[PDB]
Design an enzyme around this catalytic site. Structure first.
Site, PDB file in Angstrom:
ATOM      1  N   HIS A 118      48.908  34.400  17.576  1.00 26.70           N
ATOM      2  CA  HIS A 118      48.034  35.419  17.011  1.00 26.70           C
ATOM      3  C   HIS A 118      48.829  36.231  16.006  1.00 26.70           C
ATOM      4  O   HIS A 118      49.653  37.071  16.405  1.00 26.70           O
ATOM      5  CB  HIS A 118      47.449  36.314  18.094  1.00 26.70           C
ATOM      6  CG  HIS A 118      46.447  35.610  18.947  1.00 26.70           C
ATOM      7  ND1 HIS A 118      46.746  35.127  20.204  1.00 26.70           N
ATOM      8  CD2 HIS A 118      45.161  35.268  18.709  1.00 26.70           C
ATOM      9  CE1 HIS A 118      45.679  34.539  20.715  1.00 26.70           C
ATOM     10  NE2 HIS A 118      44.703  34.611  19.829  1.00 26.70           N
ATOM     11  N   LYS A 154      39.083  39.666  25.706  1.00 32.42           N
ATOM     12  CA  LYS A 154      38.233  38.726  26.431  1.00 32.42           C
ATOM     13  C   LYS A 154      37.400  39.377  27.526  1.00 32.42           C
ATOM     14  O   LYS A 154      36.424  38.775  27.979  1.00 32.42           O
ATOM     15  CB  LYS A 154      39.080  37.606  27.051  1.00 32.42           C
ATOM     16  CG  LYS A 154      40.045  36.935  26.074  1.00 32.42           C
ATOM     17  CD  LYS A 154      40.546  35.574  26.592  1.00 32.42           C
ATOM     18  CE  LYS A 154      40.986  35.617  28.063  1.00 32.42           C
ATOM     19  NZ  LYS A 154      40.955  34.264  28.741  1.00 32.42           N
ATOM     20  N   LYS A 182      51.360  31.878  22.522  1.00 26.69           N
ATOM     21  CA  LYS A 182      51.028  31.328  23.826  1.00 26.69           C
ATOM     22  C   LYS A 182      52.258  30.676  24.457  1.00 26.69           C
ATOM     23  O   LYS A 182      52.984  29.925  23.799  1.00 26.69           O
ATOM     24  CB  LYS A 182      49.899  30.314  23.659  1.00 26.69           C
ATOM     25  CG  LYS A 182      49.273  29.796  24.923  1.00 26.69           C
ATOM     26  CD  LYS A 182      48.050  28.954  24.553  1.00 26.69           C
ATOM     27  CE  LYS A 182      47.484  28.213  25.738  1.00 26.69           C
ATOM     28  NZ  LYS A 182      46.605  29.102  26.567  1.00 26.69           N
ATOM     29  N   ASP A 210      34.982  35.140  56.613  1.00 30.02           N
ATOM     30  CA  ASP A 210      34.192  33.952  56.874  1.00 30.02           C
ATOM     31  C   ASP A 210      34.256  33.074  55.642  1.00 30.02           C
ATOM     32  O   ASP A 210      34.210  33.578  54.517  1.00 30.02           O
ATOM     33  CB  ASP A 210      32.736  34.350  57.212  1.00 30.02           C
ATOM     34  CG  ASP A 210      31.817  33.158  57.374  1.00 30.02           C
ATOM     35  OD1 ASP A 210      31.937  32.428  58.384  1.00 30.02           O
ATOM     36  OD2 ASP A 210      30.958  32.963  56.489  1.00 30.02           O
ATOM     37  N   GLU A 254      37.866  32.484  61.539  1.00 30.43           N
ATOM     38  CA  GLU A 254      37.290  31.310  62.187  1.00 30.43           C
ATOM     39  C   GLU A 254      38.396  30.393  62.700  1.00 30.43           C
ATOM     40  O   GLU A 254      39.351  30.095  61.979  1.00 30.43           O
ATOM     41  CB  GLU A 254      36.386  30.539  61.227  1.00 30.43           C
ATOM     42  CG  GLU A 254      35.688  31.397  60.173  1.00 30.43           C
ATOM     43  CD  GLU A 254      34.617  30.633  59.405  1.00 30.43           C
ATOM     44  OE1 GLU A 254      33.952  29.769  60.013  1.00 30.43           O
ATOM     45  OE2 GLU A 254      34.448  30.892  58.195  1.00 30.43           O
ATOM     46  N   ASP A 308      25.880  34.179  54.959  1.00 35.22           N
ATOM     47  CA  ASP A 308      27.342  34.154  54.992  1.00 35.22           C
ATOM     48  C   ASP A 308      27.900  35.499  55.434  1.00 35.22           C
ATOM     49  O   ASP A 308      28.882  35.548  56.179  1.00 35.22           O
ATOM     50  CB  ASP A 308      27.915  33.762  53.630  1.00 35.22           C
ATOM     51  CG  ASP A 308      27.700  32.302  53.308  1.00 35.22           C
ATOM     52  OD1 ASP A 308      27.410  31.528  54.251  1.00 35.22           O
ATOM     53  OD2 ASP A 308      27.833  31.932  52.117  1.00 35.22           O
TER      54      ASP A 308
END
Ligand SMILES: [Mg+2]
Ligand SMILES: [Mg+2]
Ligand code: NA
Ligand code: NA
Ligand code: NA
Length: 1206
Positions: A755, A764, A781, A828, A921, A1160
């Site tokens: 950039h 973003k 990057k 869960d 669980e 859920d």
RNA sequence: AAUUUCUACUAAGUGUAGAUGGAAAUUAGGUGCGCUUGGC
DNA sequence: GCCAAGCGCACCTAATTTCCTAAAGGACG
DNA sequence: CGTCCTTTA
């Protein structure tokens, strides 16, 4: 009072690694470049891996000599007792001893040999391996490590592990006895149940082709034979018995598991299959199956592709040969063209009628015309159908509807398939022509592989359609004017099979990628430790200047160059580290004080020796407390006479009489045998050492040490600084074993996304109101991978001398017992939600509930919401499609790790906020979608030493006082259903349950028989239509139904209330209307009060199948659509104490909700409540018996808990 | 779109937030595709 | 269309072991 | 006898 968390600090120790960039300072890099140290170190890493390979050749030889000659004695007794189904607690201990004796048997066989000692000393490199080897070059490689064998110390440990007698994962004895002997015995049981199935010929084929006719297949399922299978050579034979092999001609010889599966599929049965044995440690033997040679170069693949698949190629002409064959179908008898029964008929059935099974149905219909509905009938029909070997096209024609023509349709299909091969050529004339040469490598050239794969695919698709028309082969009246030519063209078409596999196996290789390499600076024990006495030997120390830390390395020719630097009384000064460690007193005090050197200067009494030589202090069968005090006293006086220690650590011991055991004294030495401080050293002179290349200097660096860093540092930065902080009273120690690496650049900088400076970059985050950022410098990057980088790995030790020593689990039960209002965090793994969290208090009131599909964060008043459920799903699709397309397969473990690190953070915040325990669980979805195992590991890791970075280091839960609320993470293997604050509880009916009443569906409502349905309808107290409510009502007492005893209330009134999501595709069903439609279809007067006896008078089986299905949907409380966060509702067919039906959609709508907002969420809630039940179970128990409370709620106990809380 | 490293970022301008036990060794699992023989 | 048993190839992932040392000892010039 | 590598508890 305090919290429960407060009691869990300084409990046990653990080690971590802190990692840093090492930045060369001044002339350091230039001097390394001149002296050529990195090429030296890079080559050493290559040769080092070479010597390990050569070492392994010896070790594998030694392993095989021993194992091939071992007859296990305890064998028949072990196997007998291992099976025996009435093993008392005495017999279980007895079996455990025989397992140990068997492992000792193997281990002693190894450790018995002469020079087993020599396998992990310099002798194996300097002497033993040279004798064993022959190749003069391999010898020279091994010989280049003379004077460097200390570098193999860790590798030698890895190898000793293999010979341990312990039941440990890296041990040969463990792999033989605990794993393979266990599997082998399990297979003996399977062989006795399954033996009747194999016919004489099948058993003889294996005996001949697998066994060489030297054994019988029965041999390998007798106990005495286990010895044959201790080596890989034997394992390979055994596994071939189980699995078969592929001959040099490609025939798949069948093994037992194949014959078991065929028998199962033939007879609709479920006989169990055999487990194959695991590999022997350190082996690598060839497969007993033959696989052909595969292509090896970007050039050769391009050669084979253009040679064999161009338009002039023979394969191509066979396609047109076959198209002309079908195009002139009418010149051939359709009575003589045969489609073999099986998958060929399945294919042709779908191709011509739209489904694979249409031909069977048309055949079944004609069979019914003669013979017609028992299960006897359908099984005879199946047997009669399976006897048919093939179908003619003429026969197929008689099944076609009046309008369809079978032979015309086959022409139309083969036309459509050759066209598709041409369509693909239309994109591939470029890859073919002579001029073409490739730009990038196939393993990285996406655009050329897609051309190849699409053409290969279109030929395979034509090939598989052609194969359908072969027939059985031996039919009598088969047209040979078709088949002589067909077989000619088809047999050359098959050439594409090896081409396809060979091209796929090459083009899908990941290209090679270099790894970082360790730097030694010509020291085989480089940077082994930090003690000042050893600085000369290790040639590495730590320097500090201001806020900045430095690694300092003395060139081999100038090992003392730094010690000689005095403080600068006027100018600037480095702070040089002064580090003293007395490591492991339990080994270090015997080592020096019973040595040849020391026992000379200072003789212990003959009594001291006898106490030590026989272990009268070790707290064992020969423990003698008076001897333990006498030995401690000898160490003490020896210590006062050993200035290297008494001067360094001015010791302050408890009086000997106060020690209960020898560890009591060793812990005092260990806690005081550690000091860290700094001296001054002339900056000018130290810097000159780096100028002249006598010293090498690196800044120990991460981004928090940047003069532009201004935010909260990484936790690991805090750990590192705390190593040298005065407030650190030994909670975090600096450890030896630091390592330094070079990671060569892997990206080219001129190819990084940039950039550019002064040009606006798009932000973003959609919630960020600042849409753009404009910087005065470039941003690249992955910049860090575009330069060579040194990285420094620094081990540390946390709570080396723990004082809060108690059973973690017990303390948790004790604190919960005496807590008025304990909070549980229920977590869960939902269907529509990766993780769901519900917090409850001691009375089970819901305090928080939310999905963790998305992570919310807020900094500088800016919100960021990260949809990780969407990110992971995107990533899973990229990986799935890459596998199907032969393109690059992206990693997913980092994305799961980043997701879970956010989850873990939120849970640690909930734990600290609500002083809460965690309900999970007890697992005792689809693998690539899975997230829960990584979440367990990372959560347990964090709770071994749980720090809040925002706290002061010295405050409770700060970086020096981490909470340790899970036991030390050894392995998943060794975990129970409680790990400190984490309780694992049975998930049975935690989601599929009415949270407002506790009602669960205990009926079997899958349709079976007409008389079954009658029984089912007759078992309801009454069925009726309720006109004032426009509902159907089903009154039932559970005691009138099978499998019912778990329920507590027993008497329920079910109502056809609301909608349901039916799955099959999906569709919304309105129960009352669907019932009304069903009864009206059959002229049932459903208003006639009790409709029960009226329903039983029906004779159409379709009434009962439709009725049972409606009953099923009604008892389906969980209603969801796959791919829909927003359609996951829980609706009850039962009314509560106030006439209301529970509908989760009532609660999902409100900001705070008393009850679960979806199915859920309901799961997390009731997982939490199952732990609340266990807390109530601790309370009924007295303290001294708290660790005996069964925390697992039984099914009946849960139904009573859930139906009574409300 | 910068990092000890990872994930999400740009977070106020060479970085922000959280996480981060590394090295070596052994071994196992999973996905995908092809082939063989079968089932629905 | 989906699926089972087995073989093969390619890839990615992860569990469980060990060490996280100064000083005695000695080979070597 | 000093140094550097290896082995010990
Ligand atoms: Mg920061
Ligand atoms: Mg990133
Ligand atoms: Na570890
Ligand atoms: Na594998
Ligand atoms: Na596979």
């Amino acid at each position: 009072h305090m919290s429960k968390l407060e009691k869990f600090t300084n409990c046990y120790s653990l080690s971590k690694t802190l990692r840093f960039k090492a930045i060369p300072v001044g002339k350091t890099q230039e001097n390394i470049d001149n002296k050529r140290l990195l090429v030296e170190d890079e080559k050493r890493a290559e040769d080092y891996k070479g010597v390990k390979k050569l070492l392994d050749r010896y070790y594998l030889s030694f392993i095989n000599d021993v194992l091939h000659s071992i007859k296990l004695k305890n064998l028949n007794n072990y196997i007998s007792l291992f099976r025996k189904k009435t093993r008392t607690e005495k017999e279980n201990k007895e079996l455990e001893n025989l397992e140990i004796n068997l492992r000792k048997e193997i281990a002693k066989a190894f450790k018995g040999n002469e020079g087993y000692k020599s396998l992990f000393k310099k002798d194996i490199i300097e002497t033993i391996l040279p004798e064993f080897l022959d190749d003069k070059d391999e010898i020279a490689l091994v010989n280049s490590f003379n004077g460097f064998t200390t570098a193999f110390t860790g590798f030698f440990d890895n190898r000793e592990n293999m010979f341990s007698e312990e039941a440990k994962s890296t041990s040969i004895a463990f792999r033989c006895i605990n794993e393979n002997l266990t599997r082998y015995i399990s297979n003996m049981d399977i062989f006795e149940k399954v033996d009747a199935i194999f016919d004489k010929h099948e058993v003889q084929e294996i005996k001949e082709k697998i066994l060489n006719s030297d054994y019988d297949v029965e041999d390998f399922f007798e106990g005495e034979f286990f010895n044959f299978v201790l080596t890989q050579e034997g394992i390979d034979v055994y596994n071939a018995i189980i699995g078969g092999f592929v001959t040099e001609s490609g025939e798949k010889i069948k093994g037992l598991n194949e014959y078991i599966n065929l028998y199962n599929q033939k007879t609709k049965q479920k006989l169990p299959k055999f487990k194959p044995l695991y590999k022997q440690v350190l082996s690598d033997r060839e497969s007993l199956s033959f696989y052909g040679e595969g292509y090896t170069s970007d050039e050769e693949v391009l050669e084979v592709f253009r040679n064999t698949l161009n338009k002039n190629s023979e394969i191509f002409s066979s396609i047109k040969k076959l198209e002309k064959l079908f195009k002139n179908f009418d010149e051939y008898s359709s009575a003589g063209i045969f489609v073999k029964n099986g998958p060929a008929i399945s294919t042709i059935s779908k191709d011509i009628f739209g489904e694979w099974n249409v031909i069977r149905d048309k055949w079944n219909a004609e069979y019914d015309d003669i013979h017609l509905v028992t299960e006897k009938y359908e099984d005879d029909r199946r047997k009669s159908f399976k006897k048919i070997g093939s179908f003619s096209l003429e026969q197929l024609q008689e099944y076609a509807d009046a309008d369809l023509s079978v032979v015309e349709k086959l022409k139309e299909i083969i036309i459509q398939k050759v066209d598709e091969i041409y369509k693909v050529y239309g994109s591939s004339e470029k890859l073919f022509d002579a001029d073409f040469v490739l730009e990038k490598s196939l393993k990285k050239n996406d655009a050329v592989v897609a051309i190849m794969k699409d053409l290969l695919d279109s030929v395979k698709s034509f090939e598989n359609y052609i194969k359908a028309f072969f027939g059985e082969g031996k039919e009598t009246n088969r047209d040979e004017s078709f088949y002589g030519d067909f077989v000619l063209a088809y047999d050359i078409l098959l050439k594409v099979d090896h081409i396809y596999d060979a091209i796929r196996n090459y083009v899908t290789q990941k290209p090679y990628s270099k790894d970082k390499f360790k730097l030694y600076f010509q020291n085989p024990q480089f940077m082994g430790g930090w003690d000042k006495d050893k600085e000369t030997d290790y040639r590495a120390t730590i320097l500090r200047y201001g806020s900045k830390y430095y690694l300092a390395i003395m060139d081999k020719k100038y090992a003392k160059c730094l010690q000689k630097i005095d403080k600068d009384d006027v100018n600037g000064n480095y702070e040089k580290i002064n580090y003293k460690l007395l490591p492991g007193p339990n080994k270090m005090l015997p080592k020096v004080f019973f040595s040849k050197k020391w026992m000379a200067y200072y003789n212990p009494s003959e009594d001291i020796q006898k106490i030590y030589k026989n272990g009268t202090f070790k707290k064992g069968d020969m423990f003698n407390l008076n001897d333990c005090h006498k030995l401690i006293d000898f160490f003490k006086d020896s210590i006062s006479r050993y200035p290297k220690w008494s001067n360094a650590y001015d010791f302050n011991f408890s009086e000997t009489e106060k020690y209960k055991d020898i560890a009591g004294f060793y812990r005092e030495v260990e806690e005081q045998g550690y000091k860290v401080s700094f001296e001054s050293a002339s900056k000018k002179e130290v810097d000159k050492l780096v100028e002249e290349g006598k010293l090498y200097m690196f800044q120990i660096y991460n981004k928090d040490f940047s003069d532009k860093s201004h935010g909260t540092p990484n936790l690991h930065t805090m750990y590192f600084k705390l190593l040298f902080d005065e407030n650190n009273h030994g909670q975090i120690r600096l450890s030896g074993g630091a390592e330094l690496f070079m990671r060569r650049a892997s990206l080219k900088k001129e190819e990084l996304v940039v950039h550019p400076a002064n040009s606006p970059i798009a932000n973003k985050n959609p919630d960020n109101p600042k849409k753009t950022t404009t910087l005065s410098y470039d941003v690249y990057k992955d910049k860090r991978f575009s330069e060579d980088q040194y990285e420094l790995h620094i081990p540390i030790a946390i709570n080396k001398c723990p004082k809060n020593i108690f059973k973690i689990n017990t303390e948790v039960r004790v604190l919960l017992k005496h807590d008025d209002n304990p909070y549980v965090i229920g977590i869960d793994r939902g269907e529509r939600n990766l993780l769901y969290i519900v917090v409850v208090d001691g009375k089970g009131n819901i305090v928080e509930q939310y999905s963790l599909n998305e992570i919310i964060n807020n900094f500088n008043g800016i919100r960021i919401k990260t949809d990780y459920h969407s990110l992971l799903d995107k990533k899973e699709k990229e990986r799935f499609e890459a596998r199907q397309n032969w393109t690059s397969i992206e990693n997913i473990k980092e994305l799961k790790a980043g997701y879970i690190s956010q989850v873990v953070h939120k849970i640690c915040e909930l734990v600290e906020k609500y002083d809460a325990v965690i309900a999970l669980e007890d697992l005792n979805v689809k693998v690539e979608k899975q997230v829960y195992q990584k979440f367990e590991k990372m959560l347990i890791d964090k709770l071994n030493y749980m720090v809040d970075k925002k706290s002061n280091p010295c405050a409770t839960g700060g970086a020096l006082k981490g909470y340790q609320i899970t036991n030390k993470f050894e392995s998943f293997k060794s975990m129970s259903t409680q790990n400190g604050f984490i309780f694992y509880i049975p998930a049975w009916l935690t989601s599929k349950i009415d949270p407002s009443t506790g009602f669960v569906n205990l009926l079997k409502t899958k349709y079976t028989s007409i008389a079954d349905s009658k029984k089912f309808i007759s078992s309801f107290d009454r069925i009726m239509y309720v006109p004032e409510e426009d509902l159907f009502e089903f009154a039932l007492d559970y005691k009138n139904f099978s499998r019912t005893d778990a329920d507590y209330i027993k008497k329920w009134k079910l109502y056809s209330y609301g909608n349901r999501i039916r799955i099959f595709d999906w569709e919304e069903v309105c129960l009352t209307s669907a019932y009304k439609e069903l009864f009206n279809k059959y002229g049932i007067n459903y208003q006639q009060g009790d409709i029960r006896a009226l329903l039983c008078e029906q004779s159409d089986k379709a009434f009962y199948s439709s009725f049972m299905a409606l009953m099923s949907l009604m008892l389906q409380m969980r209603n969801s659509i796959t791919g829909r966060t927003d359609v996951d509702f829980l609706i009850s067919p039962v009314k509560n104490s106030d006439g209301i039906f529970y509908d989760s959609r009532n609660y999902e709508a409100q900001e705070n909700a008393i009850l679960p907002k979806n199915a859920d969420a309901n799961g997390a809630y009731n997982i939490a409540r199952k732990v609340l039940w266990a807390i109530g179970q601790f309370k009924k128990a007295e303290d001294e018996k708290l660790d005996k409370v069964k925390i697992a709620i039984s099914n009946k106990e849960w139904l009573e808990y859930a139906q009574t809380s409300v």
